[model samples]
Target: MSDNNGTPEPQVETTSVFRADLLKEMESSTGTAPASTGAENLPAGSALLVVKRGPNAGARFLLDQPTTTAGRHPESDIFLDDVTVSRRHAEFRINEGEFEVVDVGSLNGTYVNREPRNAQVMQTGDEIQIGKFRLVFLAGPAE
Candidate 1:
């Protein structure tokens, strides 16, 4: 053997490294769109009424005042175009930090969870039916 300094050559295979930067980019892009339900900016202690099923489905109303009226009349706070609903169908009133629904002697009447209610205290997620419309009540944070 001639005078030779031997160095072992290191053997290497192809290396693959995967990253989740694409997933992070997708997550960052999501949830930036404005909400379509219009419930994002509700004031504290305000009530929200959403029409679950009706002629005006997906409609939303903000009940921030002391009283709100629902009826077939155009001037009503929450108007229902159906003839089965009376001109002044019902009224929603905020009393002492609680919300109440009072049927104002409508022709078809007001019902909460399938029970007729002349006057009833409303809670979040309560379903209120009047005529052909079904409304969902969402209570805001207590004042």
Candidate 2:
């Protein structure tokens, strides 16, 4: 779904958690989601995240990338302080116009909206789980 501007609006699942400001800080870290160039013939789109529950509950971010990492370590593109989260957790990447995620060998494991696998295909609005945190993915317009 899209907003008046034609930009895809986030279609996240309703959850008990509320919003927080951690995203405000991360937004300044590296900035907007990476521009999807036609270089790899990958479809142009954006990925979004809504924190389910945590110290920074309600945190949301537009995952920038060719590679957006999630983990407890500072090196991760999306960082979490949850002890259950691995240092190098997981990543989202675009391949041939489709969204895909890869487990970075996290101890607790990463699960996509549907199932658990080392790597799995994703769709807009899918919920991903890593440890106790959750995120909803949103896709932008097709190029």
Candidate 3:
């Protein structure tokens, strides 16, 4: 009864055939996503952030507020294939009837506000154009 004087019992074992067949099945199927032929390659189902601040928030975004790297990167594709500025985890809001374009102080720059202003905060209802892409800050959910 003791291991000191007895041999160990044999262990039971089992094998799975599912994975072996899965390999064959995967190879048999032609897996590919349907092709999309559009010039604009925007990611599907992105939620656009809308500013709902008042005039004070607008003035700050246009004049005082600065966005961190990641916060600005999502919108940077519009400016440069590569974004000049890097907003990391930064959040900004544009209130109604205001406008601003943040430069993020990146090597490249963002323009607009009736003129060229850098690091400008956007207000509500303001149309800011980055490169060729124009985003109108509205109090809505239009991703």
Residue 87's lDDT within candidate 3 is: 38
Model 2 score (lDDT): 0.55
Please give, for residues 2-91, the per-residue lDDT of candidate 1 as tens digits. Answer: 211343123232322222243343345345332223233444868787888888889888787676777655546778765443555677
Query: Each prediction's TM-score against the native?
Result: 0.63, 0.59, 0.30
Where does candidate 2 stray beyond 4 Å?
1-44, 140-143
**Which prediction has more favorable lDDT, 1 or 3?**
1
What is the Å distance of residue 48 in model 3 from its true position? 5.0
Q: How many backbone clashes does candidate 3 have?
A: 18
Q: Report how far residue 75 has shifted in candidate 2, in Å.
A: 2.3
Model 3, 1-143: lDDT tens digits are: 21113322232323121212322332353364223222122223112332222222222122222221222344322222222232321223222323234443322223333234565554334444333233344333223
> After superposing candidate 3, which stretches have Cα over 4 Å from the reference?
1-101, 106-108, 141-143
Query: Residue-wise lDDT of candidate 2 within 39-83, one digit each (tens)?
Result: 233235565667766556697776555566666555466786654
Q: Where in model 1 is the C-alpha error above 4 Å?
A: 1-43, 141-143
Number of the candidate with higher TM-score, 1 or 3: 1
Indicate the TM-score of model 3.
0.30
